[PDB]
Every structure is written in structure tokens, then in C-alpha cells.
């Protein structure tokens, strides 16, 4: 089903004699999260992008500078697969039928990454309600990880990585990822979002944390630093 | 359109391909992905040998031995690929269509293999010529702009005989651009517009060096269109003769 | 003789004529040239509008990889010059027009605009055509010097976009607007010419041109499919 | 003896009522290395700084961006303590007597951090022989971690951390730390150098590596990435 | 016959030839054109030196009032092209040279430089000529496209002269006819200078001469003539 979301960091490379091909081995992200959603006409989104595009959010708390972040969005999901263990699944997606999650129902995806104002774990729920601080990137039709043949190649993919611009320094802070649409107004279909972070996972207060609910992210981000405090005394 | 088709009828030396990705597919259950690249319209391989006490084509920065290939470009080209590997012995011998220096011909199989080798280095420069009959002239004159330098960039040949010091550089236009705003100011170090270019195959280390090397040049442009396709040669006079004839052929054909 | 060739600005040959006042130069032809015959009829819908009030007709150009120069020309009227030949694009309105309608005194002051569209892959072409331009590369009003105009003031259009950086024709979709100096209603025939300095007929590498974006996409897609296949 | 070298990242803070004091808890560096050396007149250094200052090198290989690096240099060492397990000790220091390692024998310390040219593990020995690429920082009398009372407070301390300048982006690459002197020419005395890196230790090919010998650093840096390769396939 | 006219870059007429390679262009001729025939003989002193080591030969131009364009051209050799005619300047070295000496294989890689001198009044001309240049307007190596060169590589020179100062306002200009190659060179050459301005209006039309003193004498008399007419 879903192809792995890997970093752009090349570990190994070898060309295949007598062909135009070359095999590349990429360093995987320390942590990857998949998010299954469903856009139903007449159903409220998490928010709007540029005032008229339905958007759904994932929030990322980064305790310390990270080399690269990968973001991907594909629609639809039916022909690819269903959520597995550890995947995030929206209520709308659970309610949707196999037929609703497959062709011909889909939409033209769009991704936007923004830096929020929070710089401490307990400011996360607050910053989520506040306006963005800087837009880091937008991508329309960038995906090349999934061989899309059900329709035009309109799936999204963006990699934010490293006088280099500040718009790609993933330093300590809160980030919001908007999974949205190319087309303004009403749209219909399933989608799967993927987020990868190039950093060792599972080190409380040091490793990045991801969630769709800011309040929940805060709770976890706070506990994680408390754990780090405790260990350091 | 035989140039798009794959094949090196393999004999050691990995193909030098462009950075333009035609196809991509990941292998499930692994960390690997298979990429198909667009080949250069024309690729030339050049086999040389650096013998201590033997005069080079010239010097780089006054103390590095250098050997030249000259490239005449009739009209803008998307990308140029340059590669340099040392030594050659364990890879293969020159085939049909490959340039071979006199020094390389004289060298023995033993001389062309480990432990004899050197740390490669590539430099690309724009010369002054803008017309085919100015080529021999511009070759004698000083460079006009340095486009690039590469020390240890090669990733096409899996080097295991020594540290990965082989050279590889690709000069190109952003494809795709990071933004549409990119397009309004492209670093001129990258515009392979009409003109003469000199590639210096040289060394990391100053002074005397010893060993064989194979140089590769690829140009992303349809080959074999007289006066339109790029030409490559190690001798500037010869390059001029050919570049002149080619444009004459173009002139003629145009009446 | 009819319609003069549209050639690039690259000089191949040059020689002056002793004792006389003119010079003769040989120019490199474009790899591909396409001619388009149109007719602007009052009360007939254009392809679109330029600046909100100028009738416009489009040609779309898909460029797989950087190109040195593009040449665009536009002349009105056509009657006294000639009729379309084989391989020329001809609008329905032009086909319907009579010889009388296609000749003086019916004509208009031509205008050309070239714009970069958003598409960077063949299957984004139809989409980008419906979207707003991304950058304007050039405008020309009275630039033509290829056709000796003597039927009226020299108002014919000619623009060459080239390198001696927005105006570098890198991979992407371009829209050429054949339009008018004058806002509002205009009447007359016109012949457009597009030249691209690049070897023709190399599928997935050579440029493609078409007045219909959907058709252009179909062809651009097939061409890269052919290029894929050949490379494997 | 030697005080811990900690990062500048504050985990906890609390003021003491009725006083001018406040207690701060700092996040320790993921890895800290101490290096014991001895400058003997007439003995060749690792190199020279600005052509006339004796210098001794530690090399740092950084696989991926790091938030902060701490560098410290103290002289002399006698009254503080001797090397323990895991500490680097030069041959000169081993040969020196307790008397030679104590007052009145000491010198005015100086630290310089430079980015080298290597960007791959096997280029490390090479880059070490080559000229620096950028100077990141110098410090003369910055130390405030060790209460110096044997002489003027001339010990060195520098923290390199995060349009912010490139001279503090500790991205992937080789770094050379020069432990040198304020005074040009001959100097005499023991010294202890400390290096800290704000990053999780012991993750092969991801965690930073430190050594005084570039060739040895290369060997370890290479093996570490090989290990990472292997794990990723 | 031989020597092609040197015309301005001003296009009067244009017409393309249907079904062919060509478009024919009619150019505005310069108001005045002067041709200068010289010969570089090894061991013979030049007028001066360019960049200290290139032999150079001078033409001086006095311009009473702003001019649109100046054209400068230099070709080597001259033998196969033609001999000087009436109104052409001819150096003594050229007169002494034989037909053989003026033909292939004897020639050199030409080079042109144009410089503004200090004079701004006619009677300062001889003085400014001895003084250092004031500004360099242009250099050209291999610019010529007026003569179809086939005897050797196309190395003949041609130059046509927050914003710029290639402005030909009132003042003295020196044209240096020189060589690409430093040091000794051998061969004949023909230099052409065109000025886009009506000729023969004393004190208003430009004057040209290889000898600065002579140029001064004429420039002075010309303005004296203009004075007189105006009173
Ligand atoms: Ca999209
Ligand atoms: Ca190298
Ligand atoms: Ca017009
Ligand atoms: Ca100090
Ligand atoms: Ca010349």
C-alpha cells in the first residue's frame, strides 16, 4: 500500500550497468506519522487557508533543531490501503465507506507549513489559536514517492531542509502543517497525510512530538519536558 | 534518437547520466528507490596518464598539473556533466570512440592500477570565444569566468580501492526552480549559452603526481546536428576546424 | 512569395556589398516554425481578454527543456500576402471569412504578449491554462521588420525572447496572446508566427505548440511517455 | 575537582527569598569530553595559531545539525584534579610531574573554533591537513564555570549556539578546536580542555564524534556510518 | 570597389525576401567618412604605445557639437582589397611599401581604442594631444562584419559608439589603431572613421586629422569662419 516517506539524505548509491537506472538507499526519518482524513461537503474543517480553502491541521513540537521535515499528501486512499496500527484516523474517515474513499472521489491536494508563536510547551494551545508567525513553504504537485495513475499527478510533497534562509531552520518551536486543497470552496474525498522528522525518536523532551489536537500536544510536550527535568536532577 | 536508449555494452565504467529524473519507483519493504535518469545527448570519455616529469597541458593556480578538454556550444544547453576518476586499471580500458592520450597508450597495465593514483580535481571555465574561428585564439587567452570546481563529488562509481576522492560536477539550471521567483535571477555561473568552455582535469595536490585517470563529459542536448549540437575536443585548433565546418554545413544546408 | 520566413536573430553569415548601401546576412532558422491564421469578427467571442478589454487569441507552448530563443510575429491583414498552406493552423473564423473580408481596408493594429504559466509537468497543462499567468515575459506593439508593410502604417508585431533572467525559456508552459493595440471591437484577418530555436521532432525533448491546452496536454503527455519507454 | 561543563539551556529556575541569589538548573550536554595536556617549552605543538601561538587540536565530526557546542580551557590543572576514566590525556601530560602541573606554572589560555572542509567521514584526515574554511569564534577570558583564585581569571569559555549568522550553524561537517594561548611564543604549564555537544550520544552515524587524531576520528566516523547503513538495510 | 562602405547602424529601410535566407536593409551613411592607409614595419616607430607595449597609430577627431554616432573600423591587410583613392589619408610607410608587402601572408590581428582627450576649445588641441587621455570610451578586437574576411580568421576591428557617457559631446577624441598582439608586428592596414553629422559646415561639422597641430589649425580657422559669418 502506502510507500514509505523517506528523507532526502542519500546513504548509498549504485548504477545498474547497461541501463539508465541507479539504485539509491535513503535514510529514513526518525519518526513518521500517517494521518487519514476525509473531506465531506458541508462539514466544518479545522480551519481555512487564504480564507476559502478547507484545511486540516497537524501540529509539531520541536524541542531542538532538526535537519529536515518531510510532508506528503495523497488523495484518494481507497486503492492504496486502510489505516494500520499507529496511524492517525479522523472521525470523518472512520464514518466514510470504501466506495466514498475510492475513485472517482478525490481532490487536488495542497500543503502549507507555518511556524507558530509558541517557544515553550505550555504555550502550545495558546499559539494554535493565534495567527501564524512565518510561512515556511507551500507545495501543490510535488509528490514523486507514490506512482499516481488513477488521475493527474496532483499529490503534494515538500521537504524543508538545510546565508541560508530562516524559512527552513527547524529550530525549537511549534509548527502547523495545513493539509488543504488546490481548489477553493467545496471538495470531496479521502486523503492520507504523512509527516517525517529527521531526528532520533523517543527521547522525552528532546525528540519531536506530533498531534492533530494542540491541547493534547501541549499535555504530552509538557509531560515530556517534566520527565527530562526529573532525569536531570 | 539512439542517444536516449540505454547501453554501455558494459565494460567497467559506469554511464555518466544527467540529473534529470524520468522515472521513480520505491521498493516496498526496503529503504531503496529505483530512479531512471535521462542520458546526456553526447558523452565523451578521455583516458589520460600523469607521469612525473612530463609536461601537462597547463597549470591550475600556478602549481597544479592540468589537462584540457574544450567544449564549443552553438546554443544554450540545459546541463553539463563532468567526472574524473583515478586510477583506471581496475575499471577497464578505452573502447571505440574514447579519447586516449599518448601518455596513456605508453603506460603499462601495472602503471594504470593501484597503488598508483591521485586525488582528482575538476574546474570548468568560460573562455572568450563566441564564434567558431575565435576558438584557437581564446584557448591561448585567459579565462573569462570560473563556473565551478569540484574535489570529491563523484557518486556514480563505487570507489573502494581508496578514499572516495573522485570528482563529479553538474552545471545546470534549477529544474525545477525552488520558486517562480528563482527564474528572475539565475546565477550566471550556470548559463551554458553559446561559447567556448574549457574543462581542466587536474589534481587536489599541488606539484608532482602519478597515475592514470578517466574523464567524462556529458552535454544535455541532441547530438549530430551540424552547427547546432555541441562539439568537444582536447585540441583547440582541431575543435575550431570542426566547429567552423559544422556552421558552414549549416549555412549551406540553409540555401 | 507570400509570407516571409520567420528566422532567429542568430547570424550565421555576413558579407557587405562593395560600393553599395546594403548588407546581406544569413540567419539561423528556428528548429520549428508554426503559422496561425485567424480572423477577428466584431460580436464574436475571443479566446479571452488582455488587460480586461483587448480581444485575445492564444497559442500554448510546452517546453520540455531550456531553449535559446523564441520568435513571435503577428501581421494584419493577410489577404494581400497569401492563404494558409499545409501544416498551418487555421481558425474556424478565418475559414469562414471571404477574400474581401481578409484584405484591405479591413485590418487592425496588432499586439503580442508572452506569459509564463504555472505548469511544470505535461499533465498540469490544462490546469495551468485555466489559472492566472505567473510572469509576463514581454509585450510588443510595432516591432516587425520581417515583412515590408506598405498597405498601412508599420504596426505589425515582432518579439524575440532570448539570452544575450526571467526571459530564459526553461522547462514549462507558455501562453502567447495574439491581441490588439486598440481596446474594444476590432475587425480583420491576421497571421501569427511562432519560432523556437530547438531541434524538432524529439519526443519529450522538443517543444510542442497548440491553440487548445487540452490537446497540448494529451500530446505532451504521450511524448514523455514515449521518452520514458525509449529510456527503459 | 573539575566542575561539569553544562549547556546554556535553562531547565529550572528559582529565586532564594531574602537574598540576591537564584538557583538555576542547566541541561547537560549529551556528550562531554575532557582533554588533559601539557605545554613544554621546546616541544612541538599540534600546530600554530596566527603563525606564533602554540596550539593543540581536538577534531569534531558532526553527522547532523546540533544546537550548541561548549568549549572550555583551564590552566593549570594540579590544584583541580587528575584525569579520570574516559578522559583524554596527552603524552606530555603523563610525563609531567605533580609539581610541573601546579602553580606557579600556568599560562593565559585561548580558544578558537573553526569549520574545516570535510563533509563526508572519509574526507576528515584530508581536511585536517587543509586550511580552515571559516572561523566560528575566539575566546580569551570567558570562563565562569570554575572559580579561579590561583591567578587572574584568564581561563577560556565559549558557547556556539542558535537572519542568524552562519558562523554558529553547527551543521554536518568537520570542526577543529584550537586550544592555544593568549601570549605568542614559548609558554609553560598544564591545561584541561572540555568540549560539550548538545545532542544525544551513542547513536552510530547520527551522534557527534570527537578525537585529537584526525585519522582515528575518520576511522571511527566511517565505521559509524557503515553501521548506520547496515542497520538501514 | 574593393573597400566596403562604412555605414551607421541607423536603419532607413527594411524588407524581407519571401522564400529565402534574407532580409535587405538600407542604412543611413555617415555624413563624413575618412579612410586611412597605414603600414606597420618592424623597427619603425609608431605614433605611440597602447598599454605600454602595443604599437599604435592615431587619428584625432574634433567635434564642435554633440554627435549621434561614431563608427570606427580597421582591416588588415589591404593588398587584396584596394589602393587608396582620392581623399584618402596615406601614411609615408604605406607609400613606401610594395604590393607584395601589402598582401598576404603579411598581416596582423587589429585592435581599436577610442579615448576622450582634454581639449574643449580648438586651440587646446595640440596641447591635449600631448596630455594623457581623460576617459576610455571603447575597445574592440574582432568586431567587423562589413568586410567579408576570407584571407584569414575574422579578426578585423569594428566599433560603433545611473546612466552612461559614451556621449560624443563637444571635444577632442583620439582613435588608436593598434594590435591585439603586443610587440613587433608586420603588415598593411586600412582604417575607417564615420561620423553621423552633416559635413562641411565650418565650426559646426566635425574635423579629422592624423596630425594634432594640423587639426588645431583647421579647427581654429573653422570657428573663426563661423565667428565672422555670425557678425
Ligand atoms: Ca496539488
Ligand atoms: Ca578529489
Ligand atoms: Ca502594433
Ligand atoms: Ca585567556
Ligand atoms: Ca582583432
mmCIF file with all atom_site columns, C-alpha atoms in Angstrom, chain D residues 32-38 57-59 77 82-91 93-94 179 191-195 209-213 216 220:
data_model
loop_
_atom_site.group_PDB
_atom_site.id
_atom_site.type_symbol
_atom_site.label_atom_id
_atom_site.label_alt_id
_atom_site.label_comp_id
_atom_site.label_asym_id
_atom_site.label_entity_id
_atom_site.label_seq_id
_atom_site.pdbx_PDB_ins_code
_atom_site.Cartn_x
_atom_site.Cartn_y
_atom_site.Cartn_z
_atom_site.occupancy
_atom_site.B_iso_or_equiv
_atom_site.pdbx_formal_charge
_atom_site.auth_seq_id
_atom_site.auth_comp_id
_atom_site.auth_asym_id
_atom_site.auth_atom_id
_atom_site.pdbx_PDB_model_num
ATOM 1  C CA . UNK D 1 32  ? 31.303 15.904 27.255 1.00 0.00 ? 32  UNK D CA 1
ATOM 2  C CA . UNK D 1 33  ? 34.974 15.155 26.709 1.00 0.00 ? 33  UNK D CA 1
ATOM 3  C CA . UNK D 1 34  ? 37.866 16.344 28.846 1.00 0.00 ? 34  UNK D CA 1
ATOM 4  C CA . UNK D 1 35  ? 41.378 16.620 27.466 1.00 0.00 ? 35  UNK D CA 1
ATOM 5  C CA . UNK D 1 36  ? 44.480 16.920 29.636 1.00 0.00 ? 36  UNK D CA 1
ATOM 6  C CA . UNK D 1 37  ? 47.539 18.489 28.029 1.00 0.00 ? 37  UNK D CA 1
ATOM 7  C CA . UNK D 1 38  ? 50.905 19.984 28.944 1.00 0.00 ? 38  UNK D CA 1
ATOM 8  C CA . UNK D 1 57  ? 43.719 20.309 18.376 1.00 0.00 ? 57  UNK D CA 1
ATOM 9  C CA . UNK D 1 58  ? 40.538 18.418 19.025 1.00 0.00 ? 58  UNK D CA 1
ATOM 10 C CA . UNK D 1 59  ? 38.512 17.444 15.981 1.00 0.00 ? 59  UNK D CA 1
ATOM 11 C CA . UNK D 1 77  ? 45.329 21.512 36.444 1.00 0.00 ? 77  UNK D CA 1
ATOM 12 C CA . UNK D 1 82  ? 43.910 14.391 37.739 1.00 0.00 ? 82  UNK D CA 1
ATOM 13 C CA . UNK D 1 83  ? 42.395 12.752 34.640 1.00 0.00 ? 83  UNK D CA 1
ATOM 14 C CA . UNK D 1 84  ? 39.794 10.081 35.321 1.00 0.00 ? 84  UNK D CA 1
ATOM 15 C CA . UNK D 1 85  ? 38.337 7.272  33.234 1.00 0.00 ? 85  UNK D CA 1
ATOM 16 C CA . UNK D 1 86  ? 37.211 8.359  29.779 1.00 0.00 ? 86  UNK D CA 1
ATOM 17 C CA . UNK D 1 87  ? 39.364 11.492 29.770 1.00 0.00 ? 87  UNK D CA 1
ATOM 18 C CA . UNK D 1 88  ? 41.880 12.188 27.007 1.00 0.00 ? 88  UNK D CA 1
ATOM 19 C CA . UNK D 1 89  ? 45.463 12.562 28.219 1.00 0.00 ? 89  UNK D CA 1
ATOM 20 C CA . UNK D 1 90  ? 48.408 13.695 26.097 1.00 0.00 ? 90  UNK D CA 1
ATOM 21 C CA . UNK D 1 91  ? 51.822 12.041 26.391 1.00 0.00 ? 91  UNK D CA 1
ATOM 22 C CA . UNK D 1 93  ? 50.820 15.411 30.455 1.00 0.00 ? 93  UNK D CA 1
ATOM 23 C CA . UNK D 1 94  ? 51.606 11.848 31.506 1.00 0.00 ? 94  UNK D CA 1
ATOM 24 C CA . UNK D 1 179 ? 43.432 25.075 22.389 1.00 0.00 ? 179 UNK D CA 1
ATOM 25 C CA . UNK D 1 191 ? 45.796 22.609 30.956 1.00 0.00 ? 191 UNK D CA 1
ATOM 26 C CA . UNK D 1 192 ? 42.433 20.857 30.845 1.00 0.00 ? 192 UNK D CA 1
ATOM 27 C CA . UNK D 1 193 ? 40.141 21.319 27.864 1.00 0.00 ? 193 UNK D CA 1
ATOM 28 C CA . UNK D 1 194 ? 36.452 20.458 27.874 1.00 0.00 ? 194 UNK D CA 1
ATOM 29 C CA . UNK D 1 195 ? 34.100 20.031 24.935 1.00 0.00 ? 195 UNK D CA 1
ATOM 30 C CA . UNK D 1 209 ? 32.396 12.044 17.344 1.00 0.00 ? 209 UNK D CA 1
ATOM 31 C CA . UNK D 1 210 ? 35.421 13.716 18.957 1.00 0.00 ? 210 UNK D CA 1
ATOM 32 C CA . UNK D 1 211 ? 39.132 12.911 18.799 1.00 0.00 ? 211 UNK D CA 1
ATOM 33 C CA . UNK D 1 212 ? 42.565 14.539 18.933 1.00 0.00 ? 212 UNK D CA 1
ATOM 34 C CA . UNK D 1 213 ? 43.852 12.478 15.995 1.00 0.00 ? 213 UNK D CA 1
ATOM 35 C CA . UNK D 1 216 ? 41.469 7.980  14.153 1.00 0.00 ? 216 UNK D CA 1
ATOM 36 C CA . UNK D 1 220 ? 35.506 5.857  13.750 1.00 0.00 ? 220 UNK D CA 1
#
